[PDB]
Design an enzyme around this catalytic site. Structure first.
Site, short mmCIF file in Angstrom:
data_model
loop_
_atom_site.label_atom_id
_atom_site.label_comp_id
_atom_site.label_asym_id
_atom_site.label_seq_id
_atom_site.Cartn_x
_atom_site.Cartn_y
_atom_site.Cartn_z
N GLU A 133 7.38 1.47 0.99
CA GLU A 133 8.01 2.33 -0.05
C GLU A 133 8.30 3.71 0.53
O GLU A 133 7.75 4.05 1.59
CB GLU A 133 7.09 2.41 -1.30
CG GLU A 133 5.75 3.07 -0.98
CD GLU A 133 5.04 3.56 -2.25
OE1 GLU A 133 5.66 4.28 -3.06
OE2 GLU A 133 3.86 3.25 -2.49
N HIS A 154 7.64 5.69 -12.00
CA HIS A 154 6.31 5.56 -11.37
C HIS A 154 5.74 4.19 -11.52
O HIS A 154 4.59 3.85 -11.82
CB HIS A 154 5.36 6.63 -12.01
CG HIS A 154 4.24 7.00 -11.08
ND1 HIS A 154 2.91 7.09 -11.39
CD2 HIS A 154 4.34 7.25 -9.73
CE1 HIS A 154 2.24 7.43 -10.30
NE2 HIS A 154 3.05 7.51 -9.27
#
EC number: 3.1.27.-
Lengths: 110, 90
Positions: free
Chosen positions: A73, A102
């Site tokens: 990520e 998130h």
């Protein structure tokens, strides 16, 4: 030259060169330069850098798995201060997803 | 040091658990209340050294399904990676 940190800029970069742009540094690399996340000082120890490239364990199993596939990520839309809620997720076979909430929801973008 | 306390008998759902973490670790307001969000905040938000005291762990499993154990395991994996986390299980 452009500081590539948007969803499209980083996704195209990943698919085109099979690596992140040079403004990304891993959490451990940032901590070796003096980053202390609770101080929000990443731009002070590593100007122009964003956190990115660490292993993403896909803990809620929202991204599709496959034998041989791992994910990583990187932070998106970050320039300085404390981190934000936006991330790009990319697999070893170059599938690309994003989250802006998130990691609650993911959208496939490549 | 940052200290965090979970009183396990007061946790009546997975939501309660994540809201307690949000307060005790001073997480971002955008906190995603999920395991990847908790991992991200240990990796790149929370203050260290950290001391987590989790009391009445067994009772907190009762009303969180498999949530208490999966959250604990996220903390242990973070510690395994080098985060300075001390975990007290009561």
């Amino acid at each position: 030259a452009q500081v590539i940190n948007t969803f499209d800029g980083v996704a195209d970069y990943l698919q085109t060169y099979h690596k992140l742009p040079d403004n990304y540094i891993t959490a451990s690399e940032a901590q070796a330069l003096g980053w202390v996340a609770s101080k929000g000082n990443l731009a002070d120890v590593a100007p122009g850098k964003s956190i990115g490239g660490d292993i993403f364990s896909n803990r809620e199993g929202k991204l599709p798995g496959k034998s041989g596939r791992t994910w990583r990520e990187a932070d998106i839309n970050y320039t300085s201060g404390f981190r934000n809620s936006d991330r790009i997720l990319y697999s070893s076979d170059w599938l690309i997803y994003k989250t802006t909430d998130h990691y609650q929801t993911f959208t496939k973008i490549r | 040091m940052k200290k965090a306390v979970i009183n396990g008998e007061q946790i009546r759902s997975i939501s309660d658990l994540h809201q307690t973490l949000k307060k005790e670790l001073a997480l971002p307001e955008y906190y995603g209340e999920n395991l990847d969000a908790l991992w991200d905040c240990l990796a790149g938000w929370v203050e260290y050294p950290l001391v987590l005291e989790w009391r009445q762990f067994e009772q907190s499993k009762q009303l969180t399904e498999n949530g208490a154990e999966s959250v604990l395991q996220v903390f242990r994996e973070a510690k395994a990676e080098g985060c300075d986390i001390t975990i007290i299980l009561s």
